[PDB]
Write a protein that binds this ligand. Structure first.
Ligand SMILES: [Zn+2]
Lengths: 87, 50, 70, 206, 119, 135, 50, 126
RNA sequence: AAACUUUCAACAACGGAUCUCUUGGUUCUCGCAUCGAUGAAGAACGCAGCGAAAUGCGAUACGUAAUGUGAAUUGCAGAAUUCCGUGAAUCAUCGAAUCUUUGAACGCACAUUGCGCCCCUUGGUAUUCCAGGGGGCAUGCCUGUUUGAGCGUCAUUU
RNA sequence: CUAUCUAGCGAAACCACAGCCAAGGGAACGGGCUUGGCAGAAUCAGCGGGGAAAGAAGACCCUGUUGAGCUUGACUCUAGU
RNA sequence: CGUGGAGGUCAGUGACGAAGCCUAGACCGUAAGGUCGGGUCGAACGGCCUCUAGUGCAGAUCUUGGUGGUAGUAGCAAAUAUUCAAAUGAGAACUUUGAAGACUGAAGUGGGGAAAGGUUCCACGUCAACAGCAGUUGGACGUGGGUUAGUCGAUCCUAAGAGAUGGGGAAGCUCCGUUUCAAAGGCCUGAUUUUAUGCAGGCCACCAUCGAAAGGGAAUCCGGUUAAGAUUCCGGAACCUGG
RNA sequence: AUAUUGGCGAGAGACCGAUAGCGAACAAGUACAGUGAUGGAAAGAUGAAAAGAACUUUGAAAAGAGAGUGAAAAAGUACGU
């Protein structure tokens, strides 16, 4: 019984989609995420998991904001606007 | 294991030493830096002596 | 189109963020027509379609091809 | 230092009719099941991975280095050696070849080249020019694409334009006598550089 | 082609207001046409004119606010600089510059002297 | 004392490590004192602290903190050093006067192990220095 | 499921719009390598995992 | 020999840089040498090719052909000439792609900004 | 004697070795100090005339403003004349904006596109009910403002 | 109903090289070696004598200065009390 | 003897053909090997003196890939069963229509749902692959269409239990605790009609929140309609809730 | 003055040359597996240029045979050797 016929009973979910990271890793009864650790304010990660870290660190996404910071620094966090010569 | 008629060495490498090796490839670089710094300190030091 | 020809209904893709009030209002103003009820559903491609039936003072087919489709 | 080891693989141990190399676990992909770490393994760590802490530089006693450079200088005055090293001095007045200290002061390639030519070096200069070749190996793609012979070595005592003047004629190099390099006097460890000395340089020698 | 930022910057709050609603109607119609014509590129040029206007209407309002706050101690966080979370917290130059009174005296009576060796 | 927070006294290992009960925290109570009020007033900076009372169950400290964004401190010389981002949570890195103590920071033969910073000094004496021309 | 949450249906809709062959004109683009939609999916070959 | 600590003699970065050059530097790379006639007129060796320039082919099987540039097909590093084409088996025409380093310019499309560039280059004047 | 088997060769298969390539890796060295409640890193769903991805973006959605450059883009369609010009561009630069649903994540929740409270404003007869538009309500802490508590405690009205 | 024969479809195990015996000697039970018997293409269905056939570096036994589960007035400790 | 790379040298070989590969063709060497011809090929390569190593395979139940004999072999035999004709098609044991023969036998091989899937639903086109024969057929391929609610659910309630907060432990990640050793609110409306508003009355409160698509619970029915939706659209007839 | 397998900008190598070099030279932390933590590949090369084979003929078609392009088809998007 312990294999094939018992596999047919598999139709409830232990985890759903996590609001925070979007994997199907959000444990319904514990109401927490096995990957990212939501709803804890900190984000789950471990030093024994270099790969998992690499899978999710900064730069693996869009860097909507951050990606623009060093150009900004390169020009001294300028305020104002550019002049226009003429010819 | 101990064999032959040799001196008794005490090479202390029982320890993960490979995680702390410092090979000074920067020997030449740091020198060029040290000088470029000595140069420009003296520069802004007006005619003072360093 | 058949809904226009036979049911006095204008059919629209409409903001996902809309609602039967917000839709009726916009239809009522963009097209200067009166509205009987709005049904809506969320199409399986992720857009919202709105069945807007006009009151009997209006003929949707008329106002369909005023807007300029057929 | 990580290569070959970015896996949680394990031996299956014996009993599975299959070598006991560690194998990558899980499934659903081609790589689950496969030999891991370990130097007969596609994708595993190499044997005795190369380390930076290899000894690169070698020390040589200063007195001996000198001895070497000395010998190499003596050798540039022996025609038969200079010839065997492939310098084309089969003509040329005498040897050591010495040249007025006006050379130190030339400013312009064209005039430097004309100067060298007159003093007998046309032929060696050509050699280099007719010797440019695409490097045989694979270093061709490691910033070492071309190969050419070695021209004359001009030594001076003061630099008033001869260095920049000559820095673009294929094969030729310039040197202050005050310094003077074994890698230049005996290239490939072969004795007998074709050397052109300015007077100035020549008397500075002792 | 469509609108140009500069031609728009000369107009009133309320002309741009109407400009928009016409541009809106514009695209409103083209969508009806996009769907019986086998491709309608004219639309991207009006989709953008819309952006241009909104941009410029918005430029106007910000200046407005910026003006009726000129010289004032508290500006909206909106229109403050931005720089960086850190740099924003750093001492002002004044604050940093602050030297205790005992130090003031010392600095005034014993500064680094210029000098040069030889005789 | 610090009770070794292991499940039933169970230690899983060699006997030298099997202790649960005569075990002592390397940092002092006063440091635990500083560190908690510091977490509570995280907008403040911990300057110092001093003992004021104890019973069998508790030691009591008054902690001194300073407000780094109040203009009386930012304008004061003398103290505005504490506004610098490097003195963020000094009591959590053991830079308050209690921290420097427990941390073994003093001049002399009795502080060899410990005082350029223990961990840092270890790292130094366990580093294999290799020159280009090997000595 | 039938009574399905909006989040799920949303994901379902996106998952359906992605379910098409490669647009043939991409193949005509200059320096184009993409020959076919290699990330393509089927309800009877691979589940969505929600 | 390079001398600058800011230029790289590196084969790799050179190739990357050419192959990923954006339209604007690609303009500069697709420059062409003026004819001798044109070279004496403005005291200048070459210019970034442009559309509506007249041109001679001085290399390769189309040598000697002449014509107007129809487009500078930057994303291809190539230039096409209103008049230099292949006729297919099915009678269809199709542009030939030419590199401007293999052309010589015979009539510049002058233009206020074009002139200014010639001046900026140490070109004649008028 | 075929057929069959085996050996060798030619041509043809199978398979991807070899050689040559290399916008990648790897190691050294030099220069620099800049994430986040002014909402980061990270997640989700969207945005193109014609796109599934990668890349880029946020309902202003493969981008808006600005500055330089000075004619492209290009698979096809298409523009537009703007090509002696405040001006092409899937260009560079970037100082002005936009920046959905989220996330330390902040009204409460969140296997829910679930459920409140407050100010302004617009409709439906409306301070109270409904709907639309805009702006708000986390926690610890500091300095200060206001309003308070305790025979903790002072002085007084009489 | 299979097996069987046909069209279509089409795996796996295993494989040093192979495949007829008697005796001999031989790592003391040979397909090969030595001496003899012999020995004729290509094959089909069956079969279970042999291939000391095939399936997991022997379950039993011993060795190893190799373990683990378990017990106890072995050794050394320990939460607790 | 032979290999990757390095310094030197033959001003070495090469698109008039480098390297590589194939060849019961030739020659040198005891051998490791070297050399040549012919064929194929297309961009680089070699000799000599040195330098340097990630430097030479038959084996490791070696690693990765590729290939055989086995073999057109084992097999493609559970679940009673098929047959005639026409149509269509390049093609029909297998598609569609007709006829026959049978089966599931309402404890169904009927009609709906819950979990789960996620478009598999419907239409048009359509067969390379897939459906271990076939295919014109399909849950497949391509292109489209499609899910309509005050009344059906969620939503509200509370259950086992989960869990913020005053706090107490803990070096700390956090652990305990849920009315708990806490100053824990907000409901009416007068006053005031400077006003819709601050206030004057006043009672009541050991009291977060999450947790049921089968528990509790406000309210809809019949007819008609689509390729595919229907207690949701249409027609008609009602009811509940707030105002 | 010291540290620096992270971040930004650079110059290099007697390093590796697609089973090598990072796991990834490619729509690679992708496809795929697993309830989950995690595990995690394969995969580069027509030609200078698509000139990517008009047209004829056989075939239901895929294709074949001619023709044609090309320096070469002993390069045919199954593509260098
Ligand atoms: Zn998560």
């Amino acid at each position: 019984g312990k294999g094939t016929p018992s596999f047919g009973k598999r139709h409830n979910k232990s985890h759903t989609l996590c609001n925070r990271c979007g994997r199907r890793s959000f444990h319904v009864q514990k109401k927490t995420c096995s990957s990212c650790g939501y709803p804890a304010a900190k984000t789950r990660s471990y030093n024994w998991g270099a790969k998992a870290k690499r899978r999710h660190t900064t730069g693996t996404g869009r860097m909507r904001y951050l990606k623009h910071v060093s150009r900004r620094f390169k020009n001294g966090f300028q305020t104002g606007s550019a002049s226009k010569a003429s010819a | 294991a101990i064999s032959k008629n040799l001196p008794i060495l005490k090479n202390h490498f029982r320890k993960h030493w490979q995680e702390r090796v410092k090979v000074h490839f920067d020997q030449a670089g740091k020198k060029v830096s040290r000088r470029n710094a000595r140069a420009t300190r003296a520069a802004k030091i007006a005619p003072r002596p360093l | 189109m058949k809904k226009v020809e036979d049911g006095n209904i204008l059919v629209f893709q409409v903001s996902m963020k809309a609602n039967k009030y917000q839709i009726k209002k916009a239809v009522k103003e963009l097209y200067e027509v009166d509205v009987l009820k709005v049904n809506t559903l969320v199409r399986p491609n992720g857009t919202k379609k709105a069945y807007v039936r006009l009151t009997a003072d209006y003929d949707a087919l008329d106002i369909a091809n005023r807007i300029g489709y057929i | 230092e990580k290569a070959g080891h970015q896996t949680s693989a394990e031996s299956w141990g014996t009993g599975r009719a299959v070598a006991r190399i560690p194998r990558v676990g899980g499934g659903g992909t081609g790589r689950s099941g496969q030999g891991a770490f370990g130097n007969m393994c596609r994708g595993g760590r190499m044997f005795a991975p190369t380390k930076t802490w290899r000894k690169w530089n070698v020390k040589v006693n200063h007195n001996e280095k000198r001895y070497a450079t000395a010998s190499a200088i003596a050798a540039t005055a022996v025609a038969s050696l200079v010839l065997a090293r492939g310098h084309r001095v089969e003509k040329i007045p005498e040897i050591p070849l010495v040249v007025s200290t006006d050379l130190e002061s030339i400013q312009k390639t064209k005039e430097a080249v004309a100067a060298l030519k007159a003093v007998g070096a046309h032929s060696d200069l050509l050699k280099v020019l007719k010797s440019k070749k695409l490097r045989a190996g694979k270093g061709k793609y490691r910033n070492r694409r071309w190969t050419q012979r070695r021209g004359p070595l001009v030594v001076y005592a003061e630099d008033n334009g001869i260095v920049k003047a000559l820095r673009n004629v294929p094969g030729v190099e310039t040197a202050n006598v005050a310094s003077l390099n074994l890698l230049q006097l005996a290239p490939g460890a072969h004795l007998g550089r074709f050397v052109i000395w300015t007077e100035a340089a020549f008397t500075k020698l002792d | 082609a469509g609108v140009k930022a500069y031609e728009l910057r000369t107009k009133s709050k309320e002309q741009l207001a109407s400009q928009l609603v016409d541009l809106k109607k514009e695209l409103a119609e083209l969508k009806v046409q996009k769907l019986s014509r086998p491709s309608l590129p004219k639309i991207k040029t009006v989709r953008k004119s819309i952006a241009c206007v909104l941009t410029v209407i918005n430029e106007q309002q910000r200046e407005a606010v910026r003006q009726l706050y000129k010289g004032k101690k508290y500006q909206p966080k909106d229109l403050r600089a931005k720089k960086t979370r850190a740099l924003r917290r750093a001492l002002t130059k004044f604050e940093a510059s602050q030297v205790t009174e005992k130090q003031r005296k010392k600095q005034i009576a014993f500064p680094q002297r210029k000098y040069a060796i030889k005789a | 004392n610090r009770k070794r927070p292991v499940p039933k006294g169970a230690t899983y290992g060699k006997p030298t490590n099997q202790g649960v009960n005569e075990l002592k925290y390397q940092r002092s109570l006063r440091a635990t004192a500083e560190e908690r009020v510091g977490r509570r007033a995280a907008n403040l900076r911990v300057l110092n602290s001093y003992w004021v009372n104890q019973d069998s169950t508790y030691k009591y400290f008054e902690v001194i903190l300073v407000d780094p964004q109040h203009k009386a401190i930012r304008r004061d010389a003398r103290y505005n050093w504490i506004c610098d981002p490097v003195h963020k949570h000094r009591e959590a890195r053991g830079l308050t006067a209690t921290g420097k103590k427990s941390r073994g920071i003093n001049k002399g033969h009795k502080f060899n192990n410990t005082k350029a910073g223990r961990r840092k000094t270890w790292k130094r004496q366990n580093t294999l220095s290799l020159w280009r021309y090997r000595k | 499921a039938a009574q399905k949450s909006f989040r799920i249906k949303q994901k379902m809709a996106k998952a359906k719009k992605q379910n098409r062959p490669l647009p043939q004109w991409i193949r005509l683009r200059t320096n184009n390598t993409i020959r076919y939609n290699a990330k393509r999916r089927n309800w009877r070959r691979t589940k969505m995992n929600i | 020999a390079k001398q600058s600590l800011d230029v790289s003699s590196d084969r790799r970065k050179a190739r990357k840089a050419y192959f990923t050059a954006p339209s604007s530097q690609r303009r500069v790379l697709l420059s062409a040498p003026l004819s001798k006639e044109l070279r004496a007129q403005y005291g200048i060796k070459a210019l970034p090719i442009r559309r509506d320039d007249e041109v001679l082919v001085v290399r390769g099987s189309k040598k000697g052909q002449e014509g107007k540039i129809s487009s500078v097909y930057r994303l291809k590093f190539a230039v096409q000439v209103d008049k230099v084409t292949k006729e297919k088996v099915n009678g269809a025409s199709v542009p030939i792609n030419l590199h401007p380093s293999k052309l010589v310019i015979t009539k510049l499309h002058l233009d206020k900004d074009r002139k200014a560039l010639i001046q900026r280059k140490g070109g004649k004047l008028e």
